[PDB]
């Protein structure tokens, strides 16, 4: 019922999103940052587990929801600009990753493009 | 009264096909009912002339 509510249909439709669009950021960045735990640069055979369908669907919907109210090119920065800047919760990145692939419409070369820059 | 009645009439691959689909559910309505902004302008018409009426007993004292 709490993503129920994020999903900005009720609020989005209400809301203008200048001060809605920092508010999802910021989410976004404190679901990332937010207890940086699994830290280990191993955490290879882990990405398996962090696969889209054994991701839970609430996050997947979550990710879908922050993406609809948002942009791409905007999130890809920001996502460039959090993993530069500061730790991360390695869980959410990856499954992350792994949702903005599929639901993004061909993100999967804007993706090697500060793949590669990195 | 005049904004929150207007946002009344304002609400009246697999993931690539559901995400496309919400976003036209929120295709921003850019749009409200002339007649409806109308009817409030009448309303609000009505209580200025008291206000205007009220500010004139004011700036005279």
Known sequence: CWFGVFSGHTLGSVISTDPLKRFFSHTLTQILTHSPVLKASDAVQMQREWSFARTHPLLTSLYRRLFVMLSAEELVGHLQEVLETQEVHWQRVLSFVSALVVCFPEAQQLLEDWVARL | ?61
């Open chain 2, 1 to 61: 009264s005049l904004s929150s009645a207007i946002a009344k009439h304002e609400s009246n691959p697999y993931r690539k096909e559901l995400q496309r689909e919400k976003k036209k559910m929120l295709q921003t309505n850019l749009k409200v009912s002339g007649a409806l902004y109308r009817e409030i302008t009448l309303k609000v018409a009505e209580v200025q002339l008291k206000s205007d009426f009220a500010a004139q007993k004011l700036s005279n004292l």
